[PDB]
Design a protein around this ligand. Structure first.
Ligand SMILES: CC(C)(COP(=O)(O)OP(=O)(O)OC[C@H]1O[C@@H](n2cnc3c(N)ncnc32)[C@H](O)[C@@H]1OP(=O)(O)O)[C@@H](O)C(=O)NCCC(=O)NCCS
Ligand SMILES: CC(C)(COP(=O)(O)OP(=O)(O)OC[C@H]1O[C@@H](n2cnc3c(N)ncnc32)[C@H](O)[C@@H]1OP(=O)(O)O)[C@@H](O)C(=O)NCCC(=O)NCCS
Ligand SMILES: CC(C)(COP(=O)(O)OP(=O)(O)OC[C@H]1O[C@@H](n2cnc3c(N)ncnc32)[C@H](O)[C@@H]1OP(=O)(O)O)[C@@H](O)C(=O)NCCC(=O)NCCS
Lengths: 304, 303, 303
């Protein structure tokens, strides 16, 4: 168990369910603390473990204000320079005594030198109880390694341009951060918000985050940047919607550095019935060639 | 009449000086407190005073972390349905003992029914010490009452070269006890985008000299997404004027249209190491609307 | 001697009552401001006063959103290296005009050099109006100086049934202008875990009556992870006392071991759905240390 805290009114959305960004920030905190503690076991160069990838997060059951969140983490795998961390988020009602599993996630972290930033160090190794666990971890590692290799016109209903949305945010201070960079939590909250906007615009009904499927942090964001979090619908099942979210970082004045793509993610959203079963959502129809390529790649991700 | 706090690390801008948004939020808080207490003075219908206009804010000298901010407020004038409030924000260094006058502003508030909102109620009158005070107040009131009646590939020093925008989804800690959001969140965002546009146009360090006309046209509720767009309007040889507009869109109801929630005019300058305004690059308008806005920027400059 | 602000939605819970943690941080802020101004009065070494002890905080009456808090402070007694500050928190309803005495506290601060931290400096003395004031101050100072020298499967209403803990990574708005964290957030987390254990033991709505001995043993720097652990010590027929302990371990430097940063005693009470205090279930000790802590908590209760 790496983090435990109380959900408060500011942790929720306007409706009263706790924000996806808050759950993501707790997940990141737990994974980062245990990964950082593990990569300084053998007392090497002083390092901090940075989140590089959210392999997957499942929103199994909703969390609400007043409940206590216990988020625990276990180090499954460590590569040459990366560590895989599995994290479980449970909610407990302190009066009712009930405890449910709210979220389940897998993340990837990599240690960065504190002395000379941008320098990756070698993860110390971990000892496994069963060899099948270690090879299954290696298989997942090689799978994720394999996987790694915006204009809007006048909109018609149920088109990509119709739901396409965007947030623009000036990154502020980070005083007590481990490094000079800002945590993935702020950016993930913004990504979740843009995904929710796109889903609600496309489906015109209640919506729920089913899962966040692949969050990649391409490079760090420093203070004084202004980030554009752009969200677009990529592919829809009959009962689910997929949203690509892209985070681009721009220097305000510094033309020494050019605009770059800082992060990318895929959100799977669903709308449920009063009973709690996934209801049919309107189907997205692509119009351009790139939209249809992204729809096909969404179907491929759907069946694999 | 009084509000006072200590400036802390989250209160600062990227530079490490107290954010302009934080100063504006404290000014709004002080004005709202004193006018709300005054508009329930005579024990009428229970009401709350809402900020409607920032007539002007002067950033005289910067404030820094660790200092204590003292914000004082005085009700200058009362109309039939509005209150004019003058506000001073002073900084106090608790170690050196030094105290500077950091900002000076005057605001306009309107009391709104708590029982039946959207109903504007009648401000109780204030008694003036001299008749000249009330006459100057009426003059200022009538002045403010009268005055209220897409970027392609850019070339440098144009409006399009500096034009920028922030987009924000209004969440739950932006709003008050009711669904409306404080003027503070919006003013902080306007200041941020104005600073962005000014830094893009002038390519050096800059500082807000004054905030000229913040008008709050309509309320913003939770669940809206607001676009705070900033563009440069007119430049002196040593000063720049930035227009900031707040547009609010309903996310889900496409029956409902986008509306203009707030508008303001920012004056930015770039200063020397000594502290004197240095020449800023000149804005050249390209379209007809750009120079129309440049011409009224010159008009505002000469008055 | 004074700080005042208006309470906003983030300072309160869903019901509209201000969190105890926010009141505690405001008390700390006011005390620190005046302690810092006094310990730089006569132009010694440039220093800032850090909160070391909360002698007691009484929650006399609740404060709610929209009311403005006026926090006043007075320097009661100063030792060789510490300053005693008494603080009153008053709430003002700006509509009804009513003002209540909400909370009253006594705190201890110690000046630390800004140039070389960990260096304690000598508090300048204060001149008393009556000799009895200084004599009572010396008595209280010597009293406080004297005073400073695992849950298995549980059965209901024992210590293990209620014992709880929070785990927190020091985040971005927790710290001061320097690497240390304000006492306010730490006290807020202590109040939260005390409320958690109290609600687990009492199965009702509950409220903090008073917090008695908050000691800040050592500072917490950025990059620590703190465990705020709370366990029940002794229960009256209508009151509960909860001991809260704050332990900090460094995440990155594994060279350093766990250390005890803070400790406090919270007394909680149980309310009805109407709002009347109901009798609380009696805590039963099982071990020898549990019964020692129950008896010494009773001793603290009878004082
Ligand atoms: C993570 C980061 C350091 C990657 O470094 P890099 O420039 O790609 O250098 P590398 O040569 O180490 O890249 C490959 C290796 O890095 C790690 N890595 C990089 N990207 C990864 C990804 N999407 N998923 C998992 N591991 C990744 C792995 O260690 C990978 O393979 P390995 O097993 O051979 O070590 C860099 O992209 C980054 O910092 N992104 C921003 C993360 C951030 O947000 N930081 C602020 C706080 S969250
Ligand atoms: C300002 C607001 C109340 C205007 O009210 P309205 O519905 O247009 O009603 P009216 O225009 O007929 O006028 C009512 C009074 O308000 C005054 N008023 C309205 N807008 C004003 C402005 N920008 N500046 C100065 N006075 C203004 C009017 O002068 C009038 O009083 P008067 O007769 O003494 O002149 C409305 O825009 C609003 O609700 N703004 C709130 C924005 C916000 O976020 N505030 C802080 C958080 S709630
Ligand atoms: C308070 C602190 C400076 C104590 O310093 P120290 O290393 O123990 O050195 P000493 O205690 O000998 O310093 C002497 C003074 O400190 C006072 N002091 C220390 N702890 C105290 C406490 N809990 N209550 C009251 N006084 C205390 C002593 O009474 C003494 O005063 P005196 O000499 O006039 O009698 C240290 O414990 C600390 O820093 N705690 C954390 C405070 C913090 O978190 N600051 C950041 C903002 S909250």
């Amino acid at each position: 168990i790496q983090i435990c805290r109380i959900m408060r009114p500011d942790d929720a959305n306007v409706a009263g369910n706790v924000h996806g960004g808050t759950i993501l920030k707790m997940i990141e905190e737990a994974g980062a603390i245990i990964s950082t503690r593990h990569c300084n076991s053998q007392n090497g160069e002083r390092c901090v473990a940075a989140l590089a990838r959210v392999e997957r997060t499942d929103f199994l059951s909703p969390m609400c204000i007043g409940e206590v969140a216990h988020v625990s983490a276990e180090i499954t795998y460590t590569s040459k320079h990366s560590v895989e961390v599995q994290v479980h988020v449970m909610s407990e009602n302190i009066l009712t005594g009930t405890k449910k599993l709210t979220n389940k996630a897998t993340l990837w972290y990599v240690p960065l030198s504190l002395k000379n930033v941008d320098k990756v160090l070698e993860v110390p190794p971990i000892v496994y109880l069963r060899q099948e666990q270690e090879e299954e971890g290696r298989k997942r590692y090689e799978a994720q390694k394999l996987e790694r290799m915006q204009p809007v016109l006048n909109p018609e209903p149920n088109t990509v341009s119709y739901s396409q949305s965007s947030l623009i945010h000036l990154v502020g201070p980070s005083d007590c951060t481990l490094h000079g960079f800002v945590h993935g939590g702020v950016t993930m909250k913004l990504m979740d918000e843009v995904a929710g906007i796109v889903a609600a615009r496309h489906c015109k009904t209640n919506i729920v985050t089913a899962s966040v499927d692949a969050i990649n942090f391409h490079d760090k964001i420093r203070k004084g940047c202004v980030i554009t979090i752009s969200g677009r619908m990529t592919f829809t099942s009959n009962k689910s919607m997929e949203i690509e979210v892209l985070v681009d970082a721009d220097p305000v004045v510094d033309n020494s550095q050019k605009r770059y793509r800082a992060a990318s993610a895929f959100f799977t959203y669903v709308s449920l019935n009063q009973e709690g079963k996934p209801m049919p959502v309107p189907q997205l129809v692509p119009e351009t060639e790139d939209e249809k390529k992204r729809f096909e790649e969404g179907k491929g991700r759907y069946l694999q």
